[PDB]
Structures are given as C-alpha cells and as structure tokens.
Design a binder for this molecule. Sequence first.
Ligand SMILES: CC(C)(COP(=O)(O)OP(=O)(O)OC[C@H]1O[C@@H](n2cnc3c(N)ncnc32)[C@H](O)[C@@H]1OP(=O)(O)O)[C@@H](O)C(=O)NCCC(=O)NCCS
Ligand SMILES: CC(C)(COP(=O)(O)OP(=O)(O)OC[C@H]1O[C@@H](n2cnc3c(N)ncnc32)[C@H](O)[C@@H]1OP(=O)(O)O)[C@@H](O)C(=O)NCCC(=O)NCCS
Ligand SMILES: [Ba+2]
Ligand SMILES: [Ba+2]
Lengths: 82, 84, 175, 175
Amino acid sequence: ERLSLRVSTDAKKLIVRAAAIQQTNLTDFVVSNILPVAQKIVDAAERVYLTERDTKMIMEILDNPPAPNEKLLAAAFALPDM
Amino acid sequence: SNERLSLRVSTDAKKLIVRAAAIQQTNLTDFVVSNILPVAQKIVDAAERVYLTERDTKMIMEILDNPPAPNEKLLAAAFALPDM
Amino acid sequence: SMFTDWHEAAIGKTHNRMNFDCGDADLNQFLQRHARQNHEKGTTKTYVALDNSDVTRIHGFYSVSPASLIYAQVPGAISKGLGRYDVPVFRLGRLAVDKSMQGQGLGAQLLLSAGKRCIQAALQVGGVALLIDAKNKQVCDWFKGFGAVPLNDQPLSLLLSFKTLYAALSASGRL
Amino acid sequence: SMFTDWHEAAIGKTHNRMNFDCGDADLNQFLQRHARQNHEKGTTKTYVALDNSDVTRIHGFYSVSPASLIYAQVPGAISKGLGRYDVPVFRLGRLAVDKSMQGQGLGAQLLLSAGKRCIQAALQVGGVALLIDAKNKQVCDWFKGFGAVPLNDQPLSLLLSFKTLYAALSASGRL
DNA sequence: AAGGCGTACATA
DNA sequence: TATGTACGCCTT
Ligand SMILES: CC(C)(COP(=O)(O)OP(=O)(O)OC[C@H]1O[C@@H](n2cnc3c(N)ncnc32)[C@H](O)[C@@H]1OP(=O)(O)O)[C@@H](O)C(=O)NCCC(=O)NCCS
Ligand SMILES: CC(C)(COP(=O)(O)OP(=O)(O)OC[C@H]1O[C@@H](n2cnc3c(N)ncnc32)[C@H](O)[C@@H]1OP(=O)(O)O)[C@@H](O)C(=O)NCCC(=O)NCCS
Ligand SMILES: [Ba+2]
Ligand SMILES: [Ba+2]
C-alpha cells in the first residue's frame, strides 16, 4: 500500500536533504531505513513488567527454588529419549 | 499500557521549552519526550549493551555453541584459587 | 499409563497439521495456519510430538519464545550483589494435546520437554525460568500441579524455574 | 608462581584503599573514590583480594557489572532453533593487582574469581559469558592467554564463556 | 482518549 | 521538605 503522512516543512526538508546526501530517492531512503528498525522491534523479546510484590516473589523463587514434586518427576521419567 | 510524569521546573526554563516547542511546531509533551528518549537510550546502550556486527555475532555464536576447553593457564589459576 | 511412543521435532512441511484438533479453536488455528511461518521467520518456535509409527501424525505441540522479566526497584536488592535489569526467561506460550490422545500424560511430558529445550537453549543465550501462559483458571490449576507458581498480578502467568526443571530432568537422565 | 595466602571480600570500610597502587591511575582512582559508592548504590560491584595476615591490605581487585550482547541479523540462524537477540553477559570492567606483588599469579586468580561470582549470579539473573574490557593490546594479549577471544570489530573487548570457566572451576573443585 | 493544569498527600 | 505519586477536571 502507501504511507500517507503529514510532516512539518522543517522535517520534510531534512528527509529530502538526507536522501540527497545518500544518493538515493526519497522512497528507498525512508523505507530501507525503517524496516530494519521495525524488524528489530518485532523480534525483540517480550518485556514483562513486574510489580514490587511479584519481583519479591520471583527473586525469592529464583533464590530458593522448590524441589521437583511427584507430578514433574513422573513426567520426567516418562519423557522419551529423543 | 500508559503512565504519567510530573517534573517541577523553573519558570524561566518553561519559557525556554515553550519557545523551542513552538519553533519545532509541536506541543510540550512531544518536544520533551522526543528529545529525552534518544538521550536516555544512548545512555543505557553505552553502559549495558554491546551491539555486535554480523562477523562477531557468528564468531560468538560459535564460541557459545562449542566453547574451547580450559587451558593450562586457566586451570593453574583455578587450582590456586583459595576457597574460604 | 503414560503414552511414551512418540518423538519430538520442530514443525516442518511433512507434518499433518490439518488432522490436529485439541478442542480449542485458537490453538488449532495457530498450529494449522501460523506455527510454520513463525518458526521459520520469527522468534516463536513450535515443536510437535509425533507418533513413532506414522511419523506425520501430530499428537500435540508446544510453542516457546524469548521473554524478559523487568524487576521493579525493591528495598535491599542493590546491596545484595550482582543484579540485572532484564532477567531472561522463555515464554511457554502454547501447549496442546490432540483430543484423541488426551488423558495419557502427554501434556505433562511436553512441559518437561519444553523445559529441556529451553534449558539447553539457555546455555547458549541465557535464561533462568519458563514463564507459562495459562488460558483460564483450570489450565492454571493444571500447571500449578507441576510446581509452577502463579504471579500475583497478571495471574494467568506462572513461573517454573530452570533449577526445579533441571533437577527433574537430571534425575531421570534426560539431562 | 601462584600466591594463595589471600581472601576475597566485597569492598568495605576497613580496607586501606589509599595504599593500593597497581601502576594505573584510573584503576587506582576508581578504587579510591568510586568503587565504594557504586557497590552499594549502583550496578558495578567491586571485590578486593585481601592479605590473610593484614586483613586491611588490598592485594588486588576487580569490578563486574551486567551487560547484554545484541546479536546481529545472521542468515539461516532465525530458523536454526530456539534463541534470542539480547544475550546476557557480565562485564569484567576492571581487574588490578597491587605493584607490590605483580607476577605472583593473583590476576589470573581474580579472573577465575570473577568468573565464579558471575556464574553464581547468572543462576539467578541469567548470563553466559564474561565480557572483558582490555585497556590496550598488552592487557588484551594477557587475557587471550587464558583463552578469552577478542572481538573482531571491538578489539580490546574479549569474550570468555561460562562453559570454559565452569570447566576450569569444577575441575579444581571450586564449583 | 490526550495534551495540560491544579494541588494535596506518601516518601528521604 | 522535596520530590513524585496521585487525585483529578477540561478541552480539544
Ligand atoms: C491441558 C492439556 C495440554 C493436557 O494434556 P494431557 O495429555 O490431558 O495432560 P495429562 O494427560 O498429562 O494430565 C492431564 C490431566 O489433568 C486433567 N486436565 C488437564 N487440563 C485440564 C483442564 N484445562 N481442565 C480440567 N482438567 C484438566 C485431565 O483431565 C487429566 O486428568 P488424568 O490425566 O489425571 O486423567 C490438554 O487437555 C489440552 O490439549 N488442552 C487444550 C490445550 C490447552 O488448554 N492449552 C492451555 C494453555 S496453551
Ligand atoms: C595485569 C595484571 C593484573 C597482572 O598482575 P599478575 O597476574 O600479578 O601478573 P602475572 O602473575 O600474570 O605475570 C605477569 C608477567 O608480566 C609481568 N608483569 C605483571 N604486571 C606487570 C606490570 N604492571 N608492568 C610490567 N610487567 C608486569 C610479571 O612480572 C610477569 O612477568 P614474567 O613473564 O617474567 O613472570 C597487572 O599488571 C595489573 O594490575 N596492571 C594494572 C593495569 C591493569 O590491570 N589493566 C587491566 C584492566 S584493562
Ligand atoms: Ba485428530
Ligand atoms: Ba602497596
């Protein structure tokens, strides 16, 4: 499709000048620079913001983890060797 | 996922920022946040991040996949290391 | 008792996704329409439990992706030693068993199998825990039975540490 | 030659920092005026090697802090398996030995000591390697002697994986 | 549904 | 006591 945007005169001119410095036309310049940005954002790991209460609990779990229980151990011993 | 922010600033500083927001033809929030986020990320990057080239990515991925054995110098240090 | 006549593989062109039905519309849709694209082109990876006789038949699958827990400022932690702002984990986003194979312990084995895969990957990229996405209370209660702990806030998420998982896989000899 | 009559502590009040001189002003200056504040307020942790006879005498020190490696877009590696793009490491940003005892293998032991501390912290916050900053080529060559690998497009920075350090530490029984 | 202002209360 | 978090109103 198309990208329709309203940009200030100072911004349009600056994109024009930079595209000019880069010996490339205005469409390849904007686009070829913004997909790698966009690709970095979508491939980045999801961030899970914890509250204070959950941080405390998670730090404590990672410090002193519980032992594996009967259900986990049973599943582990059934797991096939691949 | 939205939040809020409130900065006590001086009265003369506020005039400065409004004139600059005006010259930039944007509103207060736009000017403040679009100018402070770049500064912020540049700061965490230099402190906490190492952006690897493709060649170093492939080198390091190989090291981490199949790391060299510890050598004689590293072992000598491990055997010297005292445990308290 | 537990069905053990299956092997694991990354989802590929060969596997019979259309025959897979777990009784949940969205999990079916992911496997059938989105799992392969995300596996080959994205960060979400999908692994399938395949029958050992007919090796295109999918008995179930899980998907895993990378995530980070952002700790909040807590009194005393800075002094406590080395820390990290963004603690790496792996999100177990999906886990599903084909209706014709439910009640045979395959779900439980896939969770251990996802743990095994994430620990092995974590050796090369970092990770301390599975972060588990639960659809509803009943699924959450199911994961809690394995020792996953629900988060207080955002309560349909549970944490299962690699240490816990590793002890179980170590004991059984899978790691 | 390996001096072993020393013990490790977090930097504290009772330790004579002004007597310490390793032949480098910044490292000396960091230990004297900054190491302390950052250790209990900030993100860099400083540990000192202390003489067993004169517990206030610093034979050496190192500072470690969390960091992340940001991988680049490598072809055929997306589908290659479960991974992530931000890989946790710990940065060994400073390592110094007092001139009064350079050449007795304390530096190599502080390197192993730093790797052990970071391996232990990584069990709770994640981490796969030490990222080592060298200040010049001679220092860099010294670290390379232990098996650290320089980055091509960031010489003066080296990587030493936790697997290599763990292999040394377990073999000597320190882990 | 957000760029702003008013203004009292919770924390070093 | 000095932020900063919170009440919020109110137009755009
Ligand atoms: C949940 C699921 C993966 C379990 O697979 P499974 O092979 O049945 O798991 P197991 O057989 O290892 O143990 C399941 C046991 O818990 C019970 N159980 C599992 N999920 C349950 C649920 N959501 N509600 C109620 N009971 C449930 C089963 O009845 C069974 O009882 P039994 O084995 O003691 O007779 C499977 O039912 C499934 O595919 N559900 C749809 C996928 C789904 O809900 N995913 C949610 C997160 S993606
Ligand atoms: C690097 C350093 C820690 C080594 O201390 P060490 O481990 O006690 O030294 P080693 O036991 O490894 O032996 C080092 C060899 O170089 C020599 N050497 C060590 N430090 C030296 C120095 N500062 N200047 C010159 N020669 C030195 C030793 O005498 C020995 O020589 P040999 O080959 O004849 O035995 C120490 O030089 C130091 O503290 N330098 C300060 C600057 C610094 O460390 N920068 C690193 C952070 S970028
Ligand atoms: Ba079926
Ligand atoms: Ba001295």
